[PDB]
From a paper:
High-resolution crystal structures and biophysical analyses of a truncated form of the TbMORN1 protein and its homologues from the parasites [name] (TgMORN1) and Plasmodium falciparum (PfMORN1) enabled, for the first time, a structure-based definition of the [name] repeat. All three structures are antiparallel dimers joined via their C-termini, and, when possessed of the correct key residues, can adopt extended or V-shaped quaternary structures. The crystal structures confirmed that each 23-amino acid [name] repeat is composed of a β-hairpin followed by a 6-residue loop that connects to the next [name] repeat. The structural studies presented here make a case that one conserved function of [name] repeats is in homotypic interactions and possibly also in higher-order assembly.
Although TgMORN1(7–15) was predominantly found as an extended dimer, a V-shaped form similar to that of PfMORN1(7–15) was also observed in the crystal lattice. The two V-shaped dimers share the same coordination sphere of a Zn2+ ion, which in TgMORN1(7–15) is provided by the Cys305 and Asp308 residues. The latter residue in turn interacts with the Ser310 from the other subunit. While the salt bridge and anion π-interactions are also conserved between the two V-shaped dimers, the aromatic stacking present in the core of the PfMORN1(7–15) dimer interface is functionally replaced in the TgMORN1(7–15) V-shaped dimer by a series of aromatic stacking interactions at its vertex. The coordination residues map to the β-hairpin of [name] repeat 13, which in TgMORN1 and PfMORN1, but not TbMORN1, contains an insertion of a glutamate residue—Glu307 and Glu308, respectively. Taking part in an anion π-interaction with a phenylalanine residue (Phe303 and Phe304, respectively), the resulting Glu-Phe pairs effectively stabilise the TgMORN1 and PfMORN1 dimers in their V-shaped form. Moreover, these very same glutamate residues further stabilise the two V-shaped dimers by being involved in a salt bridge with lysine residues (Lys321 in TgMORN1 and Lys322 in PfMORN1). The residues in the crystal structures of TgMORN1(7–15) and PfMORN1(7–15) forming the Zn2+-coordination sphere and anion π-interaction were taken as a fingerprint for a V-shaped dimer. Based on the crystallographic data, the apicomplexan [name] proteins appear capable of forming both extended and V-shaped conformations. [name] proteins in Apicomplexa have been shown to be a key component of the basal complex, which undergoes a constriction event at the end of the cell division cycle. It is therefore tempting to speculate that these extended (Zn-free) and V-shaped (Zn-bound) conformations represent the pre- and post-constriction states of the [name] proteins in the basal complex.
Author numbering:
A (entry chain A), B (entry chain A): 149 to 353
The structure:
């Protein structure tokens, strides 16, 4: 069903269209394709209000999911792409680069609880250098692989004023590391499974 | 206004009463006083459903506040008193002893975020020995004054597997303390404002 403007033999102008699956589009048409600005209500409850080109979401658009989520940002050919903000169901926001619907490039994750992250992303996960700052003041800085602390990094416990500098495997302190205390002293040791299992030396300030 | 049972010259039996301030009571009456079981709707929106003696809340009763809170437990002469559970607006529960509407005696505070406390209370605040366990695994054990860590105590950081044993002032590590690490080594030092400001010695396992 179509209720709107016709030009030549195509839908062209403004009009509402009801799709075979039950979706509904109201907005701009050009040569029989969704093109310009219009809103689209999906059978699953998702709603898109934004810009279309050649029957696809393209340009700036807002997708209010029914599962509570909400994306505001840029699209190319029906996939989020470029700069955009995802507000998760429970308040957390991602703000940064997207590629083919995946977080890829540079981005922030601002959590509701006060925590905050900024770093490199790839394949929808933290991959590369990034800083995680907790609300209490704890902070990680270093390499990430697959959303986990992984590689060379520094973790600072704001409670004790101390900092670990060493390797991380799968989000856990692993191997030979340095433990710097607030007073400047260091402890060289070996970590396994994120736990200090052997102290080898005590270095002075 | 009263709508209910009369015996002799007093309200006696079951009946509804509307008070000059707008409160409403439906329930049991004995010799013209609220006595037995009945619910009372307050002008401010608070509702009490429970037990009364001699015109006062006395026995077991539930007070659903309008500000979201909710007390389930025991009353004596219109004040919470004895064992009772307070569910705070945002999920936190106190479960333990009350005296004259104040937390006093032994009690738990089960927080929504996973944290948990149990210890001695006085004048509505933690006073005496008590253990605080955080969701991550951090743990305090020792003395409390006025809802704050205060006196001799032990604080364990589950991240670093380390533990501070020393004095606390106003919830902050203060003075000469011992810093025990997971491997058994200790660091004797001085803390000021919760921060390690001088390391005096390094003790072996
Ligand atoms: Zn720590």
């Amino acid at each position: 069903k179509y209720e709107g403007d016709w030009v030549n033999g195509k839908m062209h102008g403004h009009g509402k269209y009801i799709y075979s699956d039950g979706g509904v589009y109201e907005g701009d048409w050009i040569d029989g394709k969704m093109h310009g600005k219009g809103t689209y209500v999906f059978p699953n409850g998702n709603v898109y209000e934004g810009e279309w080109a050649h029957d696809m979401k393209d340009g700036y658009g807002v997708l209010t999911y029914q599962n509570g989520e909400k994306y505001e940002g840029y699209w190319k050919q029906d996939k989020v792409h470029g700069k955009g903000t995802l507000t998760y169901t429970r308040g957390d926001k991602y703000i940064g680069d997207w590629m083919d619907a995946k977080k890829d490039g540079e981005g922030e994750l601002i959590y509701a609880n006060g925590d905050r992250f900024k770093g490199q992303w790839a394949d929808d996960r933290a991959n590369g250098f990034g800083v995680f700052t907790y609300a209490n003041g704890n902070r990680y800085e270093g390499e990430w692989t697959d959303d986990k602390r992984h590689g060379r990094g520094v973790f600072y416990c704001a409670e004790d004023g101390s900092a670990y500098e060493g390797e991380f495997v799968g989000g856990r302190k692993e191997g030979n590391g340095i433990l710097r205390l607030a007073t400047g002293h260091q402890l060289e040791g070996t970590w396994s499974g994120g736990q200090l299992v052997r102290v080898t030396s005590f270095v002075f300030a």
